[PDB]
Amino acid sequence: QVQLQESGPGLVKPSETLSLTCTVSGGSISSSSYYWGWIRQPPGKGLEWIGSIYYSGSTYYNPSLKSRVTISVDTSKNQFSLKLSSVTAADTAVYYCARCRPEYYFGSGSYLDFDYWGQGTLVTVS
Amino acid sequence: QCVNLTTRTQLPPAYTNSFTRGVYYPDKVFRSSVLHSTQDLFLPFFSNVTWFHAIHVSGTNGTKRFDNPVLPFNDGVYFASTEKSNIIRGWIFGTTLDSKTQSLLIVNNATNVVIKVCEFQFCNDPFLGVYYHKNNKSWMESEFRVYSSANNCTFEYVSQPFLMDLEGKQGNFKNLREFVFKNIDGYFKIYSKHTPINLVRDLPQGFSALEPLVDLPIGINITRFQTLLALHRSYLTPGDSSSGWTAGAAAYYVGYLQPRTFLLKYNENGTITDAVDCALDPLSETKCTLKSFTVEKGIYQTSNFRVQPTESIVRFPNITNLCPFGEVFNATRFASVYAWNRKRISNCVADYSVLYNSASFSTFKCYGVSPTKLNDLCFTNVYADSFVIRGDEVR
Amino acid sequence: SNCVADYSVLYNSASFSTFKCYGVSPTKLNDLCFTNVYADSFVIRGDEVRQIAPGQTGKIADYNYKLPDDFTGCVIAWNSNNLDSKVGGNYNYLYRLFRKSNLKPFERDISTEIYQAGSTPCNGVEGFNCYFPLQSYGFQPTNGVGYQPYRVVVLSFELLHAPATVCGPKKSTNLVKNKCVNFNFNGLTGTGVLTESNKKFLPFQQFGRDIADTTDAVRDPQTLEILDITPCSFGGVSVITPGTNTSNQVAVLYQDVNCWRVYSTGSNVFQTRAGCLIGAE
Amino acid sequence: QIAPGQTGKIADYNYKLPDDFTGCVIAWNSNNLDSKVGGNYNYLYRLFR
Amino acid sequence: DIQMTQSPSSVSASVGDRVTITCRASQGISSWLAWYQQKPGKAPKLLIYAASSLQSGVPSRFSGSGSGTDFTLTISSLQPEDFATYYCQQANSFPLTFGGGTKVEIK
Amino acid sequence: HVNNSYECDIPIGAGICASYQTSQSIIAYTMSLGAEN
Amino acid sequence: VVNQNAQALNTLVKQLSSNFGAISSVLNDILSRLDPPEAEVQIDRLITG
Ligand SMILES: *[C@@H]1O[C@H](CO)[C@@H](O[C@@H]2O[C@H](CO)[C@@H](O[C@@H]3O[C@H](CO[C@H]4O[C@H](CO)[C@@H](O)[C@H](O)[C@@H]4O)[C@@H](O[C@H]4O[C@H](CO)[C@@H](O)[C@H](O)[C@@H]4O)[C@H](O)[C@@H]3O)[C@H](O)[C@H]2NC(C)=O)[C@H](O)[C@H]1NC(C)=O
Ligand SMILES: *[C@@H]1O[C@H](CO)[C@@H](O[C@@H]2O[C@H](CO)[C@@H](O[C@@H]3O[C@H](CO[C@H]4O[C@H](CO)[C@@H](O)[C@H](O[C@H]5O[C@H](CO)[C@@H](O)[C@H](O)[C@@H]5O)[C@@H]4O)[C@@H](O)[C@H](O)[C@@H]3O)[C@H](O)[C@H]2NC(C)=O)[C@H](O)[C@H]1NC(C)=O
Ligand SMILES: *[C@@H]1O[C@H](CO)[C@@H](O[C@@H]2O[C@H](CO)[C@@H](O[C@@H]3O[C@H](CO[C@H]4O[C@H](CO)[C@@H](O)[C@H](O)[C@@H]4O)[C@@H](O)[C@H](O)[C@@H]3O)[C@H](O)[C@H]2NC(C)=O)[C@H](O)[C@H]1NC(C)=O
Ligand SMILES: *[C@@H]1O[C@H](CO)[C@@H](O[C@@H]2O[C@H](CO)[C@@H](O[C@@H]3O[C@H](CO[C@H]4O[C@H](CO)[C@@H](O)[C@H](O)[C@@H]4O)[C@@H](O)[C@H](O)[C@@H]3O)[C@H](O)[C@H]2NC(C)=O)[C@H](O)[C@H]1NC(C)=O
Ligand SMILES: *[C@@H]1O[C@H](CO)[C@@H](O[C@@H]2O[C@H](CO)[C@@H](O)[C@H](O)[C@H]2NC(C)=O)[C@H](O)[C@H]1NC(C)=O
Ligand SMILES: *[C@@H]1O[C@H](CO)[C@@H](O[C@@H]2O[C@H](CO)[C@@H](O)[C@H](O)[C@H]2NC(C)=O)[C@H](O)[C@H]1NC(C)=O
Ligand SMILES: *[C@@H]1O[C@H](CO)[C@@H](O)[C@H](O)[C@H]1NC(C)=O
Ligand SMILES: *[C@@H]1O[C@H](CO)[C@@H](O)[C@H](O)[C@H]1NC(C)=O
Ligand SMILES: *[C@@H]1O[C@H](CO)[C@@H](O)[C@H](O)[C@H]1NC(C)=O
Ligand SMILES: *[C@@H]1O[C@H](CO)[C@@H](O)[C@H](O)[C@H]1NC(C)=O
């Protein structure tokens, strides 16, 4: 809904701070009862799911590279972030935001399918 | 099999009045910036609706209220609720609630929604439960005990799996929902609407229409209905019966539908903004007859009135003598076509009812009088004429 | 529901006995696109085709089945004297003698109970004036042809009760904007011009309407597209003359035309506020 | 099936009678003059048109 | 766990044609699937959802016949804009994974 | 019903009229032809 | 004066959606559902209204 604006740094050397943050406008975050996550895609190649987060905790992580992946959400503003201080040597890709479709009936979330994506900028290494 | 719980209290049911809610699109046509009048089933404004509770708290002056009894269905049902967590999964619709009849079902079990118009056997108080500190971690999952029987039946469904939050919080309600169920011909139509709220108690006031969601070809006989609830862990060790466990923080409302005449307002994008019940207050009646929401100074005529009679009087002579009908028809002599056979009938109470089923006649055509209304009607100077004719000359 | 239908199979080689259609022309069923069709059938006497008909409810055979006075559909029956007939007499058919009242149009009831003419509760005792309501039919091939059972089926259409589902054999074509042409959308026959629109419909919305209950927007079944319908141009015509004595030259005025739907025009054209005029300078 | 306005049968796929019609129709039994024990086939018709 | 495979790759056609893609599985996943198309230079849309169902005013003519294990997708005409990469994604288990991806380009 | 006499704004019949004045209600009276002189 | 001519014209259009005792209030529906010889009975009721 004209939303999911993303910003981040350009160049990060191996094993140093990496910070991403996603801002949503047009519907707020606390009021909704939906899920949120990220998706990563290196140049060429395909695409692989990286995580999923619900407001007030209850995160979810992919089995691979799970150890140094953390998702944090602050309700003061409409934002959430992910941290990878030590980087895998091949993490160069384009990082997106996402939102999970709402359940047809009632007011639950999930269905494990995403809509209303947003552009991701880039990340390079070294 | 389920369990029987006895830990609740007693509390008066009480009522409440419903504001301007209950409008829905009645057809599939498109309009814009036009006032139109429709005749269909609706819910009158400012009407009483029953008010129910399900709340448990405190141990000194607290109350254990747990409402889920049987209620009638009638022509239609209006349903709504407010809550914070996910309670009241679904409804059960039936006519006698046993094996010998078929009753539809809607169920939510935190993973899928199941619809199965079928036959079952429910106990006194079917429900669903949730557990805390699962000892398996990730918390808050449990089982449900509703039906103890089944049978092969006509239609079933299953939806795509989904993931839900099952925590349960405390505070002001932040959600509301509405549903309208009507049964016509052999179809089942439902409507819904969702809206965030920040109120602590009671239904709010406002205006919002509803959109059709699912229609199903069912055609079953539906007369009664009942509601499903949920409950937290008992946080004790009773025999799993005689215990209502823990009740949440939610309530629901029930109304009814009646035939009414409405006029609706639209907009250039479509949608509905407001409406007027022609049969509400005398002032609102004049709005209908002028096709406007604004009237000026003056005097207008709207309709008429009549006095309705409250008694019926029938006056007849009090003679009850029977009549020689059989002896004429059952004669063994008869006559010929050379001379007409004329026999008068008078001063005798007739009985033409037996001349319909017990007559066992072949051709019976009546001209100028309804054959089924001879008993109600009366005549005079009635005769009896007959002659012998060929079989194919009756026409 | 939801099945493509054909009727030549029921028309060309039907070899049927009784075939009457009420409220519709039998030789035109292919073009119609109706909804909510039903099929009902039973077995009845040979000479009892006079009972299943609209408005006729004056017979005891109409106390156990009803037909609405305003009914749309057809009734089909055929002779059956061999397959369902046994010389000894079949005993598998039971009928009701009489009922307390008459059934409503399309009303059904079940179960049987000993009838009592008076108020005495026989309840199976079968006392004075008590009779069982079940009636037994015996079938003999030696009887007249109107006594052995026939098989009959009744059809009940429902026009405009839902969007068209059951449609006959027809062939789709392409769409053309402007230059008003004939069209047929699911039986909503009309004549006019179709063009693109900007009215945001609803996912449960397919038709359209105006202030004067006139169709305005239609949804294309194949491409889920919405359009607009307007009637292409028309109007009156007038003639100007200076009188026959003076001369024989004339002029013509067209009422509401952007003069260029005019067909035969040469030079000396002129457009006014009223319309367009050809024949003067 | 020989009647104006009743053209809904194949019996009128070989003979036609306009709805706007004035006249009379007469018929009679013929069971011996043109009926043979062996069976005649001089009566010719058409299956469809 | 569960891995999905796509059999065709680099299928080409012209404006008036009819192509078809197939996505294979290795488990049950009865009737739960998703599709995507990534118009170059942007982020993907969704179009088909579940099996044989559209979503949110797609230009239609895109249908996928359902099945039990291995599914399919078909189109009936092509346009000078339908040029992108296509993906298949399952929606049954939690560790959700995408497919490989097929390329379509006109000539 | 009141005893005073006023003008005509909403006619009723046989010399009765209704008007809105000020608490605030609806009054009925008999019309006045004019000031005496 | 202007208002009176508005009411008179609107009522004329509103009369076009009345069955007048027929089975439908659209001419194209009748001509596409009934045979010729049975059409004139229903059409003549719409014209006379
Ligand atoms: C909320 O409710 C829903 C439904 O009420 C729950 O979903 C169901 O969960 C159960 C639990 O595992 C699952 O059962 C498994 O089913 C498979 C497949 O059975 C399907 O296919 C059969 C045909 O082969 C069909 O007859 C049957 O009805 C099912 O549709 C079983 O595999 C056996 O299937 C048949 C026996 O039916 C055998 O012949 C065969 O050889 C296999 O051995 C498994 O053994 C399980 O029994 C249901 O499949 C699932 N529902 C659906 C539609 O998939 C949901 O779990 C619940 N959630 C919570 C939190 O309670
Ligand atoms: C749910 O609540 C009920 C409330 O009482 C709990 O008690 C059960 O009640 C049901 C029906 O009310 C019983 O079902 C039948 O019980 C028969 C026992 O027979 C006596 O009780 C009958 C019910 O009160 C009563 O009608 C009967 O009189 C005549 O009527 C019968 C009609 O079916 C007839 O068949 C009898 O022969 C008799 O002539 C008797 O007074 C039993 O024979 C049946 O097979 C049937 O089960 C249950 O038995 C009651 N159960 C108990 C434990 O009392 C019920 O327990 C609650 N359920 C749960 C899960 O808690
Ligand atoms: C669906 O299931 C429902 C559950 O039973 C059915 O409801 C039943 O409906 C019948 C008929 O409407 C009710 O019967 C009642 O009968 C009394 C007594 O009237 C009797 O006498 C008169 C005069 O001789 C006669 O005309 C009647 O037919 C009766 O023989 C009436 O006073 C009542 O008004 C009512 O008609 C049953 O009581 C009712 N069941 C229950 C449990 O209330 C329903 O018929 C089923 N079908 C449908 C389509 O809903
Ligand atoms: C009914 O639908 C209407 C749309 O047809 C709604 O009116 C406007 O809707 C837009 C969103 O589409 C709101 O946001 C504005 O969008 C305009 C876009 O400019 C273009 O559209 C306007 C429409 O008037 C047109 O005038 C321009 O020339 C453009 O073609 C932005 O420029 C604005 O900054 C703003 O973002 C509008 O606020 C809304 N109102 C108006 C007056 O434009 C309408 O809200 C819907 N609901 C109702 C009850 O009418
Ligand atoms: C809603 O119900 C309440 C109580 O049942 C009604 O309040 C009274 O209802 C009784 C009927 O038993 C009337 O005699 C009283 O006049 C009512 N009190 C007042 C102040 O009106 C209430 O009227 C009902 N609301 C409705 C029917 O709209
Ligand atoms: C939760 O509790 C424990 C896990 O701490 C489990 O209970 C048993 O798990 C073992 C499998 O390792 C088996 O014995 C049974 O499957 C479980 N029940 C019993 C009685 O032993 C299990 O993960 C959970 N328990 C239940 C009842 O679901
Ligand atoms: C009419 O005559 C009968 C004959 O017994 C009698 O019972 C009845 O009371 C009479 N009617 C009146 C109104 O007296
Ligand atoms: C007259 O004959 C009919 C024919 O069966 C019979 O039912 C009826 O009882 C007879 N009438 C009398 C008075 O017996
Ligand atoms: C008539 O045609 C001209 C030229 O085609 C166009 O500019 C104009 O808008 C049309 N309509 C009127 C009312 O002039
Ligand atoms: C107004 O008229 C009534 C009518 O009888 C009379 O009783 C009353 O006294 C009058 N009031 C005044 C102030 O004159």
Author numbering:
A (entry chain h): 1 to 126
B (entry chain A): 14 to 408
C (entry chain B): 359 to 617, 633 to 654
D (entry chain C): 409 to 457
E (entry chain l): 1 to 107
F (entry chain A): 655 to 676, 689 to 703
G (entry chain A): 951 to 999
Quoted from the paper:
The viral spike glycoprotein is both the attachment factor that binds angiotensin-converting enzyme 2 (ACE2) on host cells and the viral fusogen that mediates the fusion of the viral membrane with that of the host cell. The spike glycoprotein is the main target of neutralizing antibody responses and, hence, the focus of most vaccines. We isolated a germ line-encoded monoclonal antibody (mAb) from plasmablasts activated upon mRNA vaccination against severe acute respiratory syndrome coronavirus 2 (SARS-CoV-2) and determined its structure in complex with the spike glycoprotein by electron cryomicroscopy (cryo-EM). We show that the mAb engages a previously uncharacterized neutralizing epitope on the spike N-terminal domain (NTD).
